[PDB]
Amino acid sequence: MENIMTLPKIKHVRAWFIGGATAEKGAGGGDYHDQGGNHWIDDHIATPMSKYRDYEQSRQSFGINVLGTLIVEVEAENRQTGFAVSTAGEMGCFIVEKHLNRFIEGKCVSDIKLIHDQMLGATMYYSGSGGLVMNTISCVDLALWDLFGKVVGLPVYKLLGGAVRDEIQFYATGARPDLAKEMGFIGGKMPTHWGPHDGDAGIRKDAAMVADMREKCGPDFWLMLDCWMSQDVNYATKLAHACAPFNLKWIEECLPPQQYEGYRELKRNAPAGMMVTSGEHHGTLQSFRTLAETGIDIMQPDVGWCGGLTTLVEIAALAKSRGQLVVPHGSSVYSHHAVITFTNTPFSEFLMTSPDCSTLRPQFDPILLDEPVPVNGRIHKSVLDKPGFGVELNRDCHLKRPYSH
Amino acid sequence: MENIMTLPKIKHVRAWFIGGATAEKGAGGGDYHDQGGNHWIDDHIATPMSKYRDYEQSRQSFGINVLGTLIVEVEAENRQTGFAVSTAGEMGCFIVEKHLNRFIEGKCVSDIKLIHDQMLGATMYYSGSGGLVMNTISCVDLALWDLFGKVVGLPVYKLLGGAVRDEIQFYATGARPDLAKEMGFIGGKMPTHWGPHDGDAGIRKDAAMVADMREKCGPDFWLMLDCWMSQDVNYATKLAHACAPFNLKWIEECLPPQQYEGYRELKRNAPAGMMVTSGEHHGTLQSFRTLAETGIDIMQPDVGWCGGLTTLVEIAALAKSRGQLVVPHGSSVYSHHAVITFTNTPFSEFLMTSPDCSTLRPQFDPILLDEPVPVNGRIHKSVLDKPGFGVELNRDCHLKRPYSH
């Protein structure tokens, strides 16, 4: 047998950020919500805070954009690099440069799972199993997979065992399911604009929004509702039943992440055939074990928030073992390379970054160079035939390096 | 009726830090683990990382001390101030100065619960329900209660409805239960030094450690084991049964926080009469609802990590409703003022900050001025008869202010 390919050790790990409270607001990139004004993603979206008059119209007003984008780049001894982006910004840089670097530098570029376990174990006392700290860990994990793929010379999807479908079909999230249908998407997920404090009027208005789009899009184009942790079991139950006549495919993240018991009850109360989903804010495989056992239909981890690709692959197996689907939240290429290899991820999400949902602005615009976007609502596997996650870091963005080591 | 006491509005909120990766290592204060060398708290303590040779001897080596102390001070329009400390450091300062300040400034000093709900709702998308972000929220909550108490002129324990006992009796956590007995404590909790990877030898060694202290302390002095998230169900079960002959009162935090299902199984497998506890790393009332339902005997939230005093009081009611006890993790005065009013907190914890557990070095030494310490293993309620949490900020420490607004 031939001698194996020689692999370099990891030399440096660096972290930068753009956007967030200490940089330029509206930088976009990794933080989906770090947008400018007049953006659908900030237009009276129901949230745990919209019950407050001062925070009802804008999520930005309560600080959904304070973190900004975290960028992690790992450089091997042979000078090759790999990178990834997520939501964490400056604080994410602290974690990487002042803590996690000790487990990263000096390792082989193939020691991905090892570094992953060490990051989880070393931060367990302050990670809270999700959110900020997990977003940071996820970003490092993705940067490592990117570097490994670029060193080996293969797309991440091939390293994982290959594609199980020739193309990824997408549904679009935004305020214009009708325009999404025109673009070729298979469905459209809309955000709810009213919450529990709005009562029956709120239910009537969001249900009317769904009815209107059903009329405009026809019966086969899927329609879904995203509730961004803004409701309670009763309100979610009433809304789901109010939308049943229009064949709403699923109602998403109705409750805060810790409310597993509530999700179990909500799923039990759901109209026959209508799915209940959640997961974008959950982190760690164990949390997904608990979430899966509530009986919800689809878990939706964000690859950059759940713990990384390493964790995503485990979550996919968990769901598959139960005969269920896993449909990641956004994530662009970080999701594409993974889900195209998952038999139980028949479709993916494309979260509209276009202010009015009329164009195909890239998912992480503009931090990723040559970022692929759906063509006729799909991304063919050949589009992913590039090393690692197939993109390059846009250094024309004003990247800030708050910490060093 | 007389006109009510006039209350000022909150003018400023400021955040500082000491210790941590960007300051002086070993600063102590809020971060219990930010100690120097030769400290029992870093002496081969079993952890999720001790299975790794390079991280077996020292928790500091894997970074248990990177955060340091977060200090939050709230100033009212009448110039009176209130403050609190916790574990979060520089990153905690970012959260307070760049995000949470918008919900704090301008409110009445009595709007504590309102600010609390807004902090939770606004950070839900990145808090992960515990850890770093929750520690920060908790610190703000405590600072608010401190300010309110100082403005009103009453100790927090009286504002809460008064003491239900004349003194708080303590058990001591550290490597010397025998010295703790001499000091007047009612029991001693020791850390385990070996983990699953050590197998039967590890169980034999930690059990022998317990047997030795039982011999030295007698039958009535309580002995407990702290496992700092380092085990799995089987190992914890074996260790608990190995310690049953010595009447180990309880075995604490055997599993990582997300493993609710494991805790349920462990409690079921526990020797008759032996308690199973956890909770110091959990956050948010909902997580404690789930933890409580696993059947464990005592939940141990840290007042500065679980969400604050506001959350602690709710957790106490949850436990009380189930006929169970709540015994907070460390927390000094932040716990004292609360638990002295809880019928279901018959005793409290004093975590030895003394390197060799031979003296009564204050719990948060040296960031808190005039910090009370147990006398004969107890703290009489009269010791707490000072405004707010009864202490002042030691500004002789080199406090750093990384952010402004």
Ligand SMILES: [Mg+2]
């Ligand atoms: Mg969603």
Ligand SMILES: [Mg+2]
């Ligand atoms: Mg403990």
